[PDB]
Tab-separated table of C-alpha atoms in Angstrom:
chain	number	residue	atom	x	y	z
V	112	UNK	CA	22.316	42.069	23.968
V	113	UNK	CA	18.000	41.683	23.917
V	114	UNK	CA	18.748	40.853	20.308
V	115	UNK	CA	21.594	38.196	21.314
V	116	UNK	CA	19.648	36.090	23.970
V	117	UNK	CA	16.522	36.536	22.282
V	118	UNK	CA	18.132	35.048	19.429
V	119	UNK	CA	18.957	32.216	20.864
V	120	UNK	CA	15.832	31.511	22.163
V	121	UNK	CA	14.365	32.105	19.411
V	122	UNK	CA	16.399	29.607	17.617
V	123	UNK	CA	15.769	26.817	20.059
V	124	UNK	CA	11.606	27.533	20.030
V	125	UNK	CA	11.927	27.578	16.380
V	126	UNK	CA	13.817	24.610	15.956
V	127	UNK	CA	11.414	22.488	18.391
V	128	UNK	CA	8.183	23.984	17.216
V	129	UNK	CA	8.967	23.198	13.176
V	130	UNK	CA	9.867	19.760	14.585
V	131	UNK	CA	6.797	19.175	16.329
V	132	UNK	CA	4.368	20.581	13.135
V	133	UNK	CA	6.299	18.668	10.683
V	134	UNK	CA	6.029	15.651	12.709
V	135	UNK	CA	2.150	16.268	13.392
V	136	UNK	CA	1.919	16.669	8.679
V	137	UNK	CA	4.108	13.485	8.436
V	138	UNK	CA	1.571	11.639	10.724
V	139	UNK	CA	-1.486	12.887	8.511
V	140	UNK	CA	0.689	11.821	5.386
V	141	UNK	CA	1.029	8.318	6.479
V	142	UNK	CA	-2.619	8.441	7.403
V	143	UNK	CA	-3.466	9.448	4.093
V	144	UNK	CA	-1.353	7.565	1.738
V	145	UNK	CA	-1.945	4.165	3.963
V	146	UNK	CA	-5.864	4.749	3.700
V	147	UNK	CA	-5.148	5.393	-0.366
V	148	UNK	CA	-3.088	2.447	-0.104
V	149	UNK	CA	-5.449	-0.163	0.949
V	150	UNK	CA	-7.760	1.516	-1.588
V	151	UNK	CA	-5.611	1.057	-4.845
V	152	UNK	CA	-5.081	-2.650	-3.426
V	153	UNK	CA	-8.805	-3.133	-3.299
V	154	UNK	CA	-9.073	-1.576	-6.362
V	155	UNK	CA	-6.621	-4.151	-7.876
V	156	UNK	CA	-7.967	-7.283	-6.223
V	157	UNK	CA	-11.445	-5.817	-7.359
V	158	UNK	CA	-10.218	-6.091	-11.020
V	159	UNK	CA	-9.035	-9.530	-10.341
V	160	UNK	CA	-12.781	-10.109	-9.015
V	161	UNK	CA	-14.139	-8.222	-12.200
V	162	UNK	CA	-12.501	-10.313	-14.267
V	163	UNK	CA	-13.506	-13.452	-12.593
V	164	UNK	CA	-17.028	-12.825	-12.439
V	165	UNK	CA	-16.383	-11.822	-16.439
V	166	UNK	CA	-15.386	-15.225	-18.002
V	167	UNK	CA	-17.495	-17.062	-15.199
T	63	UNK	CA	12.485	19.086	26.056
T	64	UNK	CA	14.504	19.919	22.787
T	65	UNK	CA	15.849	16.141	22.659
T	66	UNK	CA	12.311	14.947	23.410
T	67	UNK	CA	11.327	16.858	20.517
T	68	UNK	CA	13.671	15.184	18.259
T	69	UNK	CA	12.501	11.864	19.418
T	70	UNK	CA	9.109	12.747	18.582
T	71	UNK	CA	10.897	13.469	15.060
T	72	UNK	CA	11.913	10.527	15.041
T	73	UNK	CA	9.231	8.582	16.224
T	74	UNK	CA	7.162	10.232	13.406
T	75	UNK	CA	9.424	9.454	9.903
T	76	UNK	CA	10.029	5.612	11.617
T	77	UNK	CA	5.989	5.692	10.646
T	78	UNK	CA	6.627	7.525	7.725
T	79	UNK	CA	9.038	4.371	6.378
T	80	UNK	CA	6.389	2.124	7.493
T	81	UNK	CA	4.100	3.720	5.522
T	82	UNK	CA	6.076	3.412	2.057
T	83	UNK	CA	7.471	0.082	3.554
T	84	UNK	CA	3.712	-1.372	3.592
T	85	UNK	CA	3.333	0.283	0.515
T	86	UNK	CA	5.947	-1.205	-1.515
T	87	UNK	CA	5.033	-4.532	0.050
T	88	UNK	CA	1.836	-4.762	-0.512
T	89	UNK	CA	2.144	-3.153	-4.464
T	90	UNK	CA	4.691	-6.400	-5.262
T	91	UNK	CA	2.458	-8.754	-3.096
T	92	UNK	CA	-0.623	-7.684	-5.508
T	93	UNK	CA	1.693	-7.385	-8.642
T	94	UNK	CA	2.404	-11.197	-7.926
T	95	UNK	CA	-1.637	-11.923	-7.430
T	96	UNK	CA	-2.250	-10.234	-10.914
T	97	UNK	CA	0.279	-12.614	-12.662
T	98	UNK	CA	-1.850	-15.731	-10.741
T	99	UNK	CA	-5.000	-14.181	-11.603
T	100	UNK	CA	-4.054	-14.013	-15.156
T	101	UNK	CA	-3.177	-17.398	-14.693
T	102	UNK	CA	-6.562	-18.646	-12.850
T	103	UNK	CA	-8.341	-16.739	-15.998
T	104	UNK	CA	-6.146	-18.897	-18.409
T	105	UNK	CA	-7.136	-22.256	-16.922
T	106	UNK	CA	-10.915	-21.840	-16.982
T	107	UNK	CA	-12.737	-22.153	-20.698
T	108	UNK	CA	-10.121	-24.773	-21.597
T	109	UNK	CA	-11.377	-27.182	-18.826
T	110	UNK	CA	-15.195	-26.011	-19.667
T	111	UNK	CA	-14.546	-26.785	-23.317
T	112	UNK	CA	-12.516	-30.202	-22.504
T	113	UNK	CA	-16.307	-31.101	-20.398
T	114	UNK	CA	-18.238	-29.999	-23.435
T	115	UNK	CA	-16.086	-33.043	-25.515
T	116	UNK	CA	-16.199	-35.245	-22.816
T	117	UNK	CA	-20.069	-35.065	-22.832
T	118	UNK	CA	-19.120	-35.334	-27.202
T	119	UNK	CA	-17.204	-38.622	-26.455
T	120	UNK	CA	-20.149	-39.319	-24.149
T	121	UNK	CA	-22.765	-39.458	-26.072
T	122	UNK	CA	-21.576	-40.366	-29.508
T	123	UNK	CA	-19.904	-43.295	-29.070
């Protein structure tokens, strides 16, 4: 019976915890890849730059 | 609180799909400005040169 009810708590808590940790990583991830984003696209415009300032 | 949670969820991969939304965006939006910067570095030494024989045509005759 301790083993039946804790059960199901336990599979409530561990369905709402892994929720909230994976959601706190996906937030980090957009963080991340955004900032890495702009980057690359700075990167590219930079070459376009680069190669402007190469023939001028 | 276990709904909640799954909003939260929720709330969290709708900024995931921004993320690679922006992303994708943004990567064709600067694919496009290389093809117009190749352009731009196309149509420069041809108008220098066409000055250079304009001052030619300038001068000589």
């Amino acid at each position: 019976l301790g083993d039946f009810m804790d059960k199901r708590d336990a599979s409530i808590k561990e369905q709402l915890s892994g929720v909230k940790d994976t959601s706190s990583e996906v937030k980090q991830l957009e963080e991340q890849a955004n900032a890495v984003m702009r980057a690359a696209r700075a990167e590219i415009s930079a070459a376009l730059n680069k190669m402007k300032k190469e023939t001028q | 609180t276990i709904r909640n949670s799954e909003e939260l969820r929720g709330k969290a991969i709708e900024q995931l799909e921004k993320a690679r939304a922006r992303l994708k965006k943004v990567e064709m939006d600067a694919d496009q400005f290389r093809v117009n910067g190749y352009s731009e570095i196309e149509r420069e030494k041809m108008n220098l040169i066409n000055s250079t024989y304009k001052t030619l045509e300038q001068f000589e005759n």
